[PDB]
Design a protein around this ligand. Structure first.
Ligand SMILES: Nc1ncnc2c1ncn2[C@@H]1O[C@H](COP(=O)(O)OP(=O)(O)NP(=O)(O)O)[C@@H](O)[C@H]1O
Lengths: 59, 178, 54, 96, 200, 41, 53, 48
């Protein structure tokens, strides 16, 4: 748990460190999927947590 | 403590209506009573047979009837008990019993209601419920895989619904006959 | 059907005489003739009535 | 009143637990509690909750654990010192 | 079978593992079974798809993905039905060639049965044409099973070989099956079959 | 027609970029129209 | 040790895993390249103009 | 600007974090800051 968030954090951070650069996430469908309202499984937890990190970083 | 009964007292005469398939048990009973005579030409014994039949068919005693015919150490306990509500100790009983078998061979292990561990991991249940069930079932997989035919221990699984079994226990060389 | 399970034996006749039926199992080989026409249905239900009365 | 024994009461769903296996532990606890106070009567209302059939509910793990633990508790029950277990329910056929 | 599991992200992990070790041992041939059970259409369905298709798209980024190439390794997959696979998987560029494996032909059975007898003690009065024109419709595993039952029945009979009649029975039992019927019901069967045959 | 405020911001930014592509440092009116034309193709 | 074992395990698990291109991959003296430009792409005229600018 | 009052800004994502023991403290902190800085107006984007 928390590993996906730390990973996107490190990616975006070191990308901001060597600016100007380009990031390319192919197939964000597996990470930028719309958050559902059902499903209490850990996978949803980590996926939307990575999604939150992705968001707050890109904004 | 694991329920190991020394000598059984259940016979091949005290079960009826299964004569045609009974041959298998009788054959296995010779292999385990004389493990060196099948080391003669190399006839491969079963790794472990999972007894199948909807409940009330007697899957428990006819295994214990094999145990009585062989007077070998019979090891029985409920597979469902391998997932008590504490993480990590479910697999502990597995290893304990498998070394007990490797020590008191020639013996026969029996665990009715193991498909409770071998029913395919649901896509609707809690992971925390399935996580230690996962861990225990993988303990059984890896342990009974670590078993040799020459250790002189026959495994017996029992459940009523074969269709819910996961394809990992359905592997030949893990559960050869059914 | 969304079936069930009970500890009962087979019914006296109605579940034992259901052994002569051969139901349908696959959906793409089901036959159903066109329904009768309420002037044919008259004569068919009249045959049923004759059987019951006899 | 005619058994000269002690009476004990609880409900079935009392053994259903949001925590895994604690149903089994509380089954053990009740069983030993009654064992040390033999002879006695142990009456259980709401019985079909714990004594429900297998698979007919969405609680395979939990109810399965409850029933197997209670049976293996009363399977090896040879030290019955005059006690009884009286489970009360409305559907005797839906029982396991 | 080792790609289907519900824990967090392990499918994509094993996919990356197989593919990076095949890149390290390159050149190579990566053959994979059970593709229809995993490579189904990405959609909502159940909850498992939040994981199930995840693995899939990791698959998708190993065949073509980025990196623009690795060596040019060959990836081969066995699936029963192509119509059920994902759209991205079956696209020219990830699976270049597509070949069908039907049931054995006439001469196909002719050859498949005779290559299955050098492992069998057999006689010399064997003309495979009758079997090839007699076993039409079966798969290869069923021909091998026919040979297996022939050998086992030769053992249980007390002989040392298998000739014409031997195979004929074996295939006749493998095709038309093998229960009691009363002598009262048997005459119904006889009357109806005889009437149909007389009419036709 | 059918736009939102965010799309209006984006369209005037596209017009700025379209004028810059023409080398002109002064955004003219046609750039506005130019926006609609490049979204089309 | 006992404390920073899991720190190392963490930042290994939680490391950056994006492949880095067009930076000096001078572990041996290289820099990873893709090797396709706006000429070996034939068809998306509009997209190539957009990204050119 | 028309009311002539101090303004603060935040966002839903912030307080949201799956690890324990944070949200309640962040909310209490925001509100006590506001109280000590009143009058004010706490714009909070994407409340959902
Ligand atoms: N095939 C059988 N032949 C004879 N008696 C049988 C048979 N199956 C079950 N029994 C009877 O069932 C009783 C033993 O039941 P038990 O020890 O609880 O195992 P079981 O539950 O019936 N087997 P299982 O259905 O797998 O749980 C005895 O009275 C046996 O005589």
């Amino acid at each position: 748990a928390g590993v996906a968030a730390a990973r996107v954090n490190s990616l975006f951070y070191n990308a901001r460190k060597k600016a100007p650069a380009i990031i390319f996430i192919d197939e964000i469908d597996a990470i930028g999927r719309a958050r559902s309202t059902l499903g209490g499984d850990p996978g949803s937890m980590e996926r939307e947590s990575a999604l939150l990190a992705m968001l707050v970083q890109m904004d | 403590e694991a329920r190991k009964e020394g000598l059984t007292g259940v016979e091949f005469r005290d079960v009826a209506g299964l004569g045609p398939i009974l041959n298998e048990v009788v054959e296995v009973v010779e292999f385990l009573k004389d493990p060196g005579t099948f080391s003669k030409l190399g006839a491969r014994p079963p790794k472990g047979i999972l007894l199948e039949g909807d409940p009330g068919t007697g899957k428990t005693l006819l295994a214990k009837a094999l145990a009585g015919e062989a007077m070998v150490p019979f090891y029985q306990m409920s597979g469902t008990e391998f997932t008590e509500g504490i993480v990590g100790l479910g697999a502990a009983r597995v290893r304990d019993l498998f070394k007990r078998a490797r020590a008191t061979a020639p013996c026969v292990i029996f665990v009715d209601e193991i498909d409770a561990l071998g029913l395919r991991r649901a896509e609707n249940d809690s992971a925390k419920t399935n996580e230690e069930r996962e861990q225990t079932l993988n303990q059984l997989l890896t342990e009974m895989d670590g078993f040799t035919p020459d250790t002189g221990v026959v495994f017996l699984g029992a459940t009523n619904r074969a269709d819910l079994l996961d394809p990992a226990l359905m592997r030949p060389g893990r559960f050869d006959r059914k | 059907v969304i079936g069930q399970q009970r500890a009962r034996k087979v019914v006296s006749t109605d579940a034992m005489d259901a052994f002569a039926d051969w139901p349908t199992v696959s959906e793409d080989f089901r036959f159903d003739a066109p329904s009768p026409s309420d002037v044919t249905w008259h004569r068919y239900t009249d045959e049923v009535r004759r059987v019951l009365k006899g | 009143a005619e058994g000269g024994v002690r009476m004990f009461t609880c409900s079935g769903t009392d053994f259903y637990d949001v925590y895994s296996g604690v149903g089994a532990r509380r089954v053990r606890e009740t069983f030993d509690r009654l064992r040390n106070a033999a002879p006695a009567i142990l009456f259980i209302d709401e019985f079909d909750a714990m004594g429900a059939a297998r698979g007919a509910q969405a609680s395979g793990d939990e109810s399965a654990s409850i029933i197997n633990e209670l049976l293996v508790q009363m399977d090896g029950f040879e030290d019955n010192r005059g006690i009884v277990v009286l489970g009360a329910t409305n559907r005797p056929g839906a029982i396991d | 079978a080792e790609f289907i599991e519900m824990y967090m992200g392990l499918g994509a992990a094993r996919v990356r593992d197989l593919f990076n070790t095949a890149r390290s041992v390159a050149p190579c041939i990566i053959f994979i079974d059970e593709l229809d059970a995993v490579g189904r259409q990405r959609q909502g369905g159940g909850r498992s798809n939040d994981e199930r298709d995840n693995t899939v798209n990791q698959l998708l980024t190993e065949m073509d993905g980025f990196e623009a190439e690795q060596q040019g390794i060959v990836v081969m997959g066995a699936t029963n039905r192509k119509d059920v696979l994902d759209a991205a998987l079956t696209r020219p560029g990830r699976f270049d060639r597509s070949i069908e494996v039907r049931r054995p032909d006439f001469q196909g059975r002719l050859e498949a049965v005779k290559v299955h007898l050098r492992d069998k003690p057999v006689a010399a009065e064997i003309d495979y044409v009758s079997l090839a024109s007699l076993m039409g419709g079966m798969s290869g595993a069923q021909i091998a099973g026919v040979a297996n039952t022939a050998c086992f029945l030769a053992s249980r009979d007390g002989r040392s070989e298998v000739n014409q009649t031997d195979l004929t029975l074996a295939v006749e039992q493998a095709k038309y099956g093998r229960r009691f019927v009363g002598a009262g019901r048997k005459k119904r069967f006889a009357v109806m079959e005889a009437s149909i045959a007389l009419a036709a | 027609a059918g736009f939102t405020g965010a799309d209006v911001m984006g369209l005037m930014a596209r017009a700025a970029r379209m004028a810059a592509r023409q080398g002109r440092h002064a955004i003219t009116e046609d750039d506005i129209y130019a926006a609609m034309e490049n979204k089309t193709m | 040790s006992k404390q920073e074992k899991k720190e190392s395990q963490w930042e290994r698990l939680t490391s950056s895993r994006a492949r880095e291109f067009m930076t000096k991959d001078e572990k041996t003296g290289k820099m990873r390249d893709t090797g396709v430009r706006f000429e070996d792409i034939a068809g998306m005229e509009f997209l190539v103009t957009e990204m050119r600018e």
